[PDB]
């Protein structure tokens, strides 16, 4: 509760400062072995108001947006996004037509330059070494990682532990 109160006090200088502060703390927590702490801090940050574009849930697409995040924050968001995807397929509540990762958003999408972007390669390698060769790239967009519903049907995925 002391941590939540200090977070509430800090959430008064602006979302511009808040996003950078959360990026810094998430990178630190991820690269210091505190994956569970990073996940819980991201969870308490989401309901605060920071990273409003992080998650989208609907019959069409389940998306995770990381273009504004750091490498550490992207890994933490991907870790909890993959876990939530595994929560479905345990119930008969249908499945979205598509699951995407917004690695790069902007003009770079319609170009091959975004293919070599650090965010894109980092997200692709994380997905490849966690859920095998299931999340492939998009043949129309140069900054998205996609996975069709058929490949979702065949799909706790990431182990979150404190060092």
């Amino acid at each position: 509760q002391i941590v939540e109160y200090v977070l509430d006090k800090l959430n008064s200088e602006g979302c511009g400062l808040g996003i950078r502060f959360y990026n810094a703390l998430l990178d630190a927590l991820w690269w210091l072995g505190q994956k569970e702490r990073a996940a819980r801090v991201l969870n308490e940050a989401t309901k605060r108001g920071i990273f409003p574009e992080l998650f989208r849930k609907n019959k069409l697409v389940w998306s995770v947006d990381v273009h504004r995040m750091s490498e550490g924050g992207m890994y933490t968001a991907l870790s909890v996004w993959l876990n939530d995807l595994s929560d479905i397929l345990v119930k008969g509540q249908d499945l979205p037509q598509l699951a995407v990762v917004v690695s790069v958003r902007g003009q770079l999408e319609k170009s091959s330059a975004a293919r070599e972007s650090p965010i894109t390669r980092a997200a692709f390698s994380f997905l490849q070494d966690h859920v095998s060769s299931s999340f492939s790239f998009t043949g129309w967009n140069g900054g998205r990682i996609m996975c069709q519903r058929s490949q979702l049907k065949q799909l706790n995925i990431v182990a979150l532990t404190n060092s």
């Binding site: 069409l60 037509q97 598509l98 043949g139 129309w140 069709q148």
Partner: peptide, 14 residues
């Protein structure tokens, strides 16, 4: 324009 992109556009447009 693959069949995958066409099907996705069909669903989203519908």
């Amino acid at each position: 324009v693959s069949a995958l992109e066409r099907s996705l556009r069909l669903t989203f447009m519908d």
